[PDB]
Amino acid sequence: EVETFAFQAEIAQLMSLIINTFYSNKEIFLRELISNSSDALDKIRYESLTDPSKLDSGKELHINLIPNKQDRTLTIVDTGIGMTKADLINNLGTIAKSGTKAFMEALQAGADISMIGQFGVGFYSAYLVAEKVTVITKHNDDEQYAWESSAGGSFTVRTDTGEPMGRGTKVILHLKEDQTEYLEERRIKEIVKKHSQFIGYPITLFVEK
């Protein structure tokens, strides 16, 4: 069972702008997704402070970066709070409708696309480098789901049958054919050092055979 949903008009517009605007500083997508992961980890940590059983689904709080050159994917995994089905449908737990409005107002007042994260919609910077994004997620209060979109106005949600995650979110970037630099270890390390050097959770860059 696969359910298909339309993006709200403002999010469709945001996604089209990210896809079609000329903007060379694409590397900021990784900073934005690592920042989202850190926020998600903060949230489950905060809940655990009064209810330790919130971490029964996994005590380790971390961020993994996984490139796969055969599949042409870069995956960002975190063990944060995850998303419920309702969260996924509601723009992956963001205030994306109003955040988009603020972002577009900022752009007309001179802001840069790199400032997307200041408006709560940094997730959508994934489409600077990905033709399709798959999000696998597990929240303590719900089952494991896969969200997916190639833009074009719609996303899908389905129950996920893959490897059970325990708790957290996996963002799988199916990269554009000319964006394969983001699979090279040297490039990922450079970006992490430049933009994410002080994130308060361990970031592990996996390597490949």
Swiss-Prot record:
Residues 1-209 are annotated as: Interaction with NR3C1. ISGylated. Changing E32A: Strong ATP-binding. Strong interaction with HSF1, HIF1A, ERBB2, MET, KEAP1 and RHOBTB2. No effect on interaction with TSC1. It is found in: Nucleus; Cytoplasm; Melanosome; Cell membrane. It comes from the Eukaryota. The modification N6-acetyllysine is found at K43, K69. ATP binds at N36, D78, K97, F123. Changing D78A: Impaired ATP-binding. Strong interaction with HIF1A, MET, KEAP1 and RHOBTB2. Loss of interaction with HSF1 and ERBB2. Los of interaction with TSC1. The TPR repeat-binding motif mediates interaction with TPR repeat-containing proteins like the co-chaperone STUB1. Homodimer. Identified in NR3C1/GCR steroid receptor-chaperone complexes formed at least by NR3C1, HSP90AA1 and a variety of proteins containing TPR repeats such as FKBP4, FKBP5, PPID, PPP5C or STIP1. Forms a complex containing HSP90AA1, TSC1 and TSC2; TSC1 is required to recruit TCS2 to the complex. The closed form interacts (via the middle domain and TPR repeat-binding motif) with co-chaperone TSC1 (via C-terminus). Interacts with TOM34. Interacts with TERT; the interaction, together with PTGES3, is required for correct assembly and stabilization of the TERT holoenzyme complex. Molecular chaperone that promotes the maturation, structural maintenance and proper regulation of specific target proteins involved for instance in cell cycle control and signal transduction. Undergoes a functional cycle that is linked to its ATPase activity which is essential for its chaperone activity. This cycle probably induces conformational changes in the client proteins, thereby causing their activation. Interacts dynamically with various co-chaperones that modulate its substrate recognition, ATPase cycle and chaperone function. Belongs to the heat shock protein 90 family. This is Heat shock protein HSP 90-alpha.
